[PDB]
Design a protein around this ligand. Sequence first.
Ligand SMILES: CC[C@@H](c1ccccc1)c1c(O)c2c(oc1=O)CCCCC2
Lengths: 99, 99
Amino acid sequence: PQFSLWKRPVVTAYIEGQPVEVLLDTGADDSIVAGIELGNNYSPKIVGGIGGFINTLEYKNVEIEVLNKKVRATIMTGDTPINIFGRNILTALGMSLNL
Amino acid sequence: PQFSLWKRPVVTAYIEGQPVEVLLDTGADDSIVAGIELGNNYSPKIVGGIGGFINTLEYKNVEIEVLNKKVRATIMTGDTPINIFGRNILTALGMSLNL
Ligand SMILES: CC[C@@H](c1ccccc1)c1c(O)c2c(oc1=O)CCCCC2
């Protein structure tokens, strides 16, 4: 599909079966989502946002379903004011920025 | 043209003559950059993102030069840790995000 960027490129994803709304971010290197609990392994971690730092948890080998595609990705969880899917999952789906 | 998101989508930009390296961010509604001085014709703004807020000076109708194109868009200066070009500028260049 094609996202015209005239409005926020939002969409539905299922993190291990759980539906959440996310904004596709081409400037971020990683992925952060709030409101999710998982059984995969993890390790604590601090991320730097545009405004400052927040505390997160990082899970690995997390199965994600987006745009009818399934991938095994690494994702962070914490109290973010906006859910985002960064480049790490975008490249695995074959997405590109055209002009 | 087209970027594969395997590498951070960074380009060189020419804002009113002054060169800046910027990141193309589809998750950002606006454009904020640091180091560029554009005059005594500005309006104070505050913007929020992950980790907090940033105080900016909004300048309208600034002349930009990126990807062999000349546009006139709105830029915000402030203390950002990374220079961003958001949806307002990406729509003006006609860029899209495809899967
Ligand atoms: C929330 C969306 C966005 C943003 C940009 C400008 C103003 C307000 C909000 C945003 C990003 O795209 C990234 C980070 O943090 C952010 O807040 C983290 C690090 C930098 C790149 C990605």
